[PDB]
């Protein structure tokens, strides 16, 4: 009997598909527990206002305010203690 000349090295197919499965599954969580220091803010509200403020000065195109506000936001990032200092919700 003859069959059309699919079904070659199927174990390959198996191994690569399952390792692709591994890639996605580890992708969902690989080090996401590391990405646990950014989701605790009670209100990122002031961060919003300042970031749109840097955008504002962007169109109004003032010189030092730009890098000034970028450095402030960067410092806000540096300290978690600072991410939480005033972000504690209004009493």
């Amino acid at each position: 009997k003859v069959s059309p000349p699919a079904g070659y090295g199927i174990v390959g197919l198996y191994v690569s598909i399952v390792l692709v499965v591994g890639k996605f599954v580890r992708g969902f969580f690989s080090e996401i527990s590391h990405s646990i220091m950014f989701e605790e803010l009670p209100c990122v509200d002031r961060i919003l206002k300042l970031c749109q403020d840097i955008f504002l000065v962007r169109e109004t195109r003032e010189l030092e305010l730009e890098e000034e506000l970028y450095a402030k936001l960067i410092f806000l990032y540096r300290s978690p203690e600072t991410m939480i200092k005033w972000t504690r919700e209004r009493e």
């Binding site: 174990v11 499965v21 591994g22 996401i32 527990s33 605790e40 919700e89």
Partner: protein, 486 residues
């Protein structure tokens, strides 16, 4: 009502709170330092209770190192055995104390039980009282000596401790190696009757099994001495170990005994009530069997690991079906396809088995338990245990690997039933076998932890089946938290 209000509402100041080791060092450091440590230890405790020449020296030391290491290994194994000895001792020592009271009865023939008890509020594990000279010199001496006698004693108490395991071993082996009609039918029924009630699983049943054994052996005797061939009893070795099974069972009765255990309308309504007290009362016995509160320790993890091992056993049994019982290259598997439906059915069944076992673990409902036992028994009996299984050329020649799988499932099922006896899944704590945390334990668990696909299956099942406020993110992060923590 703040479901996520607490996630960001947390305060901080309030938040803050108010043996083999010689083998290790010898593999690391010069073992000469290790023996110097061992004898200087000997020195310290004994105080407590009160370079060609160098080449031959290292070689002689090496010979001594080998002797010392062997001695250390036996001591460590002995320590493990000793751990078993303490649990058995609980029984041994309480029995010794009561025996001494009996000794008093022999010396003083009188009758007061409570008075002799008084020399020894009515229920205590510890009973500190007067102490009799012979007992103390006896254990002190026994403790003082040991080179291999420790092993002998350990054998004595372990065998006493096991009590019923060997009967299981013999029953499974005899039928698996030789399976006549009775030899194969009897085990399933004996397991089911046995795995029912903790105080006394079989009121009189053990005797029924043993009596069957004497009559069948007698039958064999006359058999050596036609229609007889029709019966599923065949010429073979005169006997292998049935006498040993019978002696072991007799010892079982002796131990139970030594410990102490047992072993107008008027007439029409009376007859109906009697019938109710036989069969409906038996149904009530099943109900009390299924009633709440029997207490035994719970170890889910041993079941889960045993199950995965069972899958390992099954998967190992794949190439043997082919013309290659040696786990050869995959190409043969590609080019053989020697009736592969059985592999898929078995694997599907075992995965379903794992799913249901976890489901029972989380919800602890009886129907799952019964489903487990019934499905396993029917599967084993229908799938195997007659001429059709010998469809593969596995009559008895290599017909042990499937049997190997058979007993492993059998032990698992029995321990599963024991777990049913304990129940109590709600109360949990880490597996003490895992909680021994040994580097070997650590390696085994991590290897379990490196296999593909584990994370999603465990996370998804627990997530659906855990019944509190929980997001997929929080819980899955928690498994990650467990990974770093361990």
């Amino acid at each position: 009502l703040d479901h996520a209000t607490v996630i960001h509402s947390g305060d901080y100041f309030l938040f803050e709170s108010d043996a083999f080791q010689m083998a290790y060092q010898a593999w690391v450091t010069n073992a000469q330092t290790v023996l110097r440590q061992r004898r200087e230890r000997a020195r310290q405790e004994r105080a407590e209770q009160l370079g060609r020449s160098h080449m031959m020296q290292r070689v002689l030391s090496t010979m001594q190192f080998l002797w010392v290491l062997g001695q250390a290994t036996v001591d460590g194994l002995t320590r493990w055995l000793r751990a078993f000895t303490k649990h058995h001792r609980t029984m041994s020592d309480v029995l010794c104390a009561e025996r001494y009271l009996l000794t008093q009865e022999l010396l003083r023939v009188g009758e007061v039980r409570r008075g002799v008890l008084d020399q020894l509020a009515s229920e205590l594990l510890l009973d500190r009282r007067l102490h009799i000279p012979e007992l103390e010199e006896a254990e002190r001496f026994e403790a003082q000596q040991g080179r291999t006698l420790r092993l002998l004693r350990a054998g004595y108490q372990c065998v006493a401790a096991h009590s019923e395991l060997l009967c299981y071993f013999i029953i499974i082996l005899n039928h698996m190696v030789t399976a006549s009609a009775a030899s194969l039918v009897l085990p399933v029924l004996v397991f089911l009757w046995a795995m029912l009630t903790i105080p006394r699983p079989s009121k009189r049943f053990w005797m029924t099994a043993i009596v069957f054994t004497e009559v069948m052996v007698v039958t064999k005797y006359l058999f050596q001495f036609p229609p007889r061939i029709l019966g599923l009893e065949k010429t073979d070795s005169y006997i292998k170990y049935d006498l040993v099974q019978l002696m072991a069972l007799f010892f079982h009765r002796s131990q139970l005994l030594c410990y102490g255990l047992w072993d107008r309308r008027l007439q029409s309504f009376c007859v109906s009530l009697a019938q109710s007290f036989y069969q409906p009362l038996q149904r009530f016995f099943h109900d009390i069997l299924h009633t709440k509160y029997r207490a035994a320790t719970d170890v889910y993890a041993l079941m889960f690991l045993a199950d995965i091992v069972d899958i390992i056993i099954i998967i190992f049994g794949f190439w043997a079906f082919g013309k290659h019982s040696a786990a050869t290259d995959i190409a043969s598997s590609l080019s053989d396809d020697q009736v592969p439906q059985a592999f898929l059915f078995m694997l599907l069944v075992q995965f379903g088995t794992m799913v249901i076992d976890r489901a029972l673990y989380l919800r602890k409902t009886v129907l799952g338990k019964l489903a487990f036992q019934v499905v396993l028994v029917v599967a084993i009996h229908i799938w195997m245990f007659f001429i059709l299984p010998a469809v593969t050329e596995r009559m008895f020649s290599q017909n042990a690997v499937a049997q190997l799988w058979y007993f492993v499932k059998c032990i698992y099922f029995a321990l599963s039933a024991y777990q049913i006896r304990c129940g109590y899944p709600t109360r949990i704590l880490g597996n003490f076998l895992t909680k021994k945390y040994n580097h070997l334990n650590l390696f085994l668990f991590q290897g379990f932890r490196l296999v593909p696909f584990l994370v999603e299956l465990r996370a998804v099942m627990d997530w659906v089946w855990t019944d509190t406020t929980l997001s997929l993110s929080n819980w899955m992060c928690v498994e990650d938290i467990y990974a770093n923590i361990f």
